[PDB]
Design a protein around this ligand. Structure first.
Ligand SMILES: NC(=O)C1=CN([C@@H]2O[C@H](COP(=O)(O)OP(=O)(O)OC[C@H]3O[C@@H](n4cnc5c(N)ncnc54)[C@H](OP(=O)(O)O)[C@@H]3O)[C@@H](O)[C@H]2O)C=CC1
Ligand SMILES: NC(=O)C1=CN([C@@H]2O[C@H](COP(=O)(O)OP(=O)(O)OC[C@H]3O[C@@H](n4cnc5c(N)ncnc54)[C@H](OP(=O)(O)O)[C@@H]3O)[C@@H](O)[C@H]2O)C=CC1
Ligand SMILES: CS(=O)(=O)Nc1ccc(-c2nc(N)nc(N)c2C#CC2CC2)cc1
Ligand SMILES: CS(=O)(=O)Nc1ccc(-c2nc(N)nc(N)c2C#CC2CC2)cc1
Ligand SMILES: [Co+2]
Ligand SMILES: [Co+2]
Lengths: 159, 159
């Protein structure tokens, strides 16, 4: 299986300035459940944002995707192509904008946390990918995060 | 990833007299999506309850469990133990009440439908198995069927 998991504002923004303009610990915990024990695949420009001590994410096969035939990533594989990263029954694309649209033809699951924030698509913002009509998904109800923003999960599937 | 998929009345009842005592077509498209393309595994009794002109289920690796070796499951694969039947990146156990309880010690995922119907448990009914104490699950909204029923989706992942 190949699933994508992201959190987006309602405008569709996932990131800005090479980082994320929110922090919901309820999404930290959902994201950790989904991914734990499986392969996680992330863009190089996502691996760096991650401080050296939080990294690699524990108990998961960390794969960074880069063009650099000699990128370092202590504690992960660096692979130059997506398919190289497929040989677990569960592989989770965890960001960001470039790698999302790249893995979208491989994906049968999308796990979306929708964050109820007015965040206009301005900058060189990274955005969530486009889910066309082949994607069936169950919308959630707004839960209140302790940070103060609302949110709700989304699970999309196509066979 | 072993997953179990079942449609449940709030009491737990999933079958009775070899039939499923409701109609809710949204569950059928839901069940069809998650299982399509993968191995599906069922108990013998469940194989029997499908009219021949709609079994085996299209596009899926039909397998039947029975303890009796010589059984004809025409278009499926008669296997003598659950383990011998779990061969795919994605195996979905689809009933009935006996195999679920047999399969759950090997599951990582449960996809539950919950039909809003007073259906008291009745001696000899097939029942959904028991979960919520190491299974974390994300619910979803009380949907409204075109049969008329209220029903909601659960997706469970065991921590
Ligand atoms: N759920 C969320 O809200 C998430 C948000 N984010 C945000 O997303 C943003 C980062 O995403 P983005 O900015 O799009 O960059 P990415 O995170 O998509 O990483 C981009 C890198 O992917 C590599 N790459 C792309 N295509 C290929 C290929 N075909 N072969 C090999 N390597 C390839 C390049 O690495 P190189 O440059 O080495 O070639 C590129 O720099 C950040 O702001 C981050 O905070 C991140 C994760 C999740
Ligand atoms: N989501 C839902 O609501 C669903 C509901 N159902 C309902 O479930 C009910 C039937 O389920 P149930 O009555 O529990 O019977 P099952 O469908 O669970 O089939 C039970 C059979 O499994 C086989 N079996 C059990 N343990 C083993 C083992 N260790 N090794 C090999 N074979 C084994 C036996 O086959 P044998 O006797 O051949 O040895 C036994 O008869 C029906 O009413 C059906 O409609 C069905 C599917 C889904
Ligand atoms: C300090 S933190 O852990 O709380 N920040 C935090 C928490 C959760 C997420 C997150 N959420 C969803 N829904 N999907 C995702 N792919 C991610 C991710 C990621 C890559 C590590 C960057 C992102 C940041
Ligand atoms: C119009 S209907 O409701 O009466 N038909 C119908 C009946 C049952 C389901 C269903 N659902 C979930 N969630 N799990 C499942 N294992 C099943 C099953 C099964 C039979 C083994 C094939 C879907 C539709
Ligand atoms: Co998992
Ligand atoms: Co599938």
């Amino acid at each position: 299986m190949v699933g994508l998991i992201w959190a987006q504002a309602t405008s569709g923004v996932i990131g800005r300035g090479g980082d994320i303009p929110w922090r919901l610990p309820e999404d930290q915990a959902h994201f950790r459940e989904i991914t734990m024990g499986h392969t996680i695949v992330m863009g190089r420009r996502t691996w760096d944002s991650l401080p050296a001590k939080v990294r690699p994410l524990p108990g998961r096969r960390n794969v960074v995707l880069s063009r650099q035939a000699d990128f370092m990533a202590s504690g992960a594989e660096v692979v130059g192509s997506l398919e190289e990263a497929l040989t677990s029954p569960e592989t989770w694309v965890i960001g960001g904008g470039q790698v999302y649209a790249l893995a979208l033809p491989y994906a049968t699951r999308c796990e979306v946390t929708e964050v109820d924030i007015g965040l206009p698509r301005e900058a060189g913002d990274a955005l969530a990918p486009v889910l066309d009509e082949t994607w069936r998904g169950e919308t959630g109800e707004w839960r209140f995060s302790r940070s103060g923003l609302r949110y709700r999960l989304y699970s999309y599937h196509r066979s």
